Design a protein around this motif. Structure first.
Motif, mmCIF file in Angstrom:
data_model
loop_
_atom_site.group_PDB
_atom_site.id
_atom_site.type_symbol
_atom_site.label_atom_id
_atom_site.label_comp_id
_atom_site.label_asym_id
_atom_site.label_seq_id
_atom_site.Cartn_x
_atom_site.Cartn_y
_atom_site.Cartn_z
ATOM 1 N N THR A 174 67.277 20.830 100.103
ATOM 2 C CA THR A 174 65.945 20.415 99.663
ATOM 3 C C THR A 174 65.406 21.327 98.552
ATOM 4 O OG1 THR A 174 65.414 19.461 101.831
ATOM 5 C CG2 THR A 174 63.560 20.008 100.468
ATOM 6 N N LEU A 175 65.744 22.618 98.612
ATOM 7 C CA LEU A 175 65.301 23.585 97.600
ATOM 8 C C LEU A 175 66.343 23.747 96.493
ATOM 9 C CD1 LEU A 175 67.027 26.479 98.193
ATOM 10 C CD2 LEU A 175 65.755 26.137 100.325
ATOM 11 N N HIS A 176 67.620 23.837 96.879
ATOM 12 C CA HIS A 176 68.697 23.995 95.911
ATOM 13 C C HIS A 176 68.813 22.741 95.044
ATOM 14 C CE1 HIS A 176 72.717 22.231 95.374
ATOM 15 N NE2 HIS A 176 72.734 21.804 96.623
ATOM 16 N N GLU A 177 68.456 21.584 95.612
ATOM 17 C CA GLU A 177 68.482 20.339 94.861
ATOM 18 C C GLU A 177 67.349 20.336 93.835
ATOM 19 O OE1 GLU A 177 66.511 16.675 95.671
ATOM 20 O OE2 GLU A 177 65.211 18.266 94.892
ATOM 21 N N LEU A 178 66.311 21.154 94.086
ATOM 22 C CA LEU A 178 65.179 21.248 93.165
ATOM 23 C C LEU A 178 65.567 22.038 91.917
ATOM 24 C CD1 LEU A 178 62.620 22.127 95.933
ATOM 25 C CD2 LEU A 178 62.529 20.007 94.602
ATOM 26 N N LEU A 179 65.789 23.343 92.090
ATOM 27 C CA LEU A 179 66.170 24.218 90.983
ATOM 28 C C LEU A 179 67.653 24.579 91.054
ATOM 29 C CD1 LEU A 179 63.044 25.251 92.035
ATOM 30 C CD2 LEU A 179 63.286 26.352 89.799
ATOM 31 N N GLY A 180 68.081 25.104 92.204
ATOM 32 C CA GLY A 180 69.471 25.489 92.381
ATOM 33 C C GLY A 180 69.666 26.992 92.316
ATOM 34 N N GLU A 181 69.276 27.686 93.387
ATOM 35 C CA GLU A 181 69.403 29.140 93.454
ATOM 36 C C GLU A 181 70.776 29.547 93.990
ATOM 37 O OE1 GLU A 181 68.942 32.311 96.135
ATOM 38 O OE2 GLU A 181 66.763 32.133 95.905
ATOM 39 N N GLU A 182 71.594 30.136 93.119
ATOM 40 C CA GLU A 182 72.933 30.579 93.497
ATOM 41 C C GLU A 182 72.986 32.098 93.650
ATOM 42 O OE1 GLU A 182 74.830 28.412 94.742
ATOM 43 O OE2 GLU A 182 76.465 27.887 93.371
ATOM 44 N N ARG A 183 73.743 32.560 94.645
ATOM 45 C CA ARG A 183 73.888 33.991 94.904
ATOM 46 C C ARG A 183 74.699 34.666 93.800
ATOM 47 N NH1 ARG A 183 70.970 36.441 96.277
ATOM 48 N NH2 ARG A 183 71.749 37.426 94.352
ATOM 49 N N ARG A 184 75.866 34.096 93.492
ATOM 50 C CA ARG A 184 76.738 34.638 92.454
ATOM 51 C C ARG A 184 76.795 33.705 91.245
ATOM 52 N NH1 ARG A 184 81.805 37.497 95.787
ATOM 53 N NH2 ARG A 184 81.769 35.671 97.184
#
Length: 33
Positions: free
Chosen positions: A23-33
């Motif tokens: 729901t959040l990653h589909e918004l912006l897309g916060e990746e660790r690496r």
């Protein structure tokens, strides 16, 4: 690993681990690496 977001290639251990992240990653897309 077990699941996989419909947007990103990130593999989580449980479906819920994504359900909340998608729901959040589909918004912006916060990746660790």
């Amino acid at each position: 690993y077990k699941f996989a977001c419909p947007e990103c290639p990130k593999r989580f251990m449980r479906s819920d681990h994504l359900s909340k992240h998608i729901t959040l990653h589909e918004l912006l897309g916060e990746e660790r690496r």
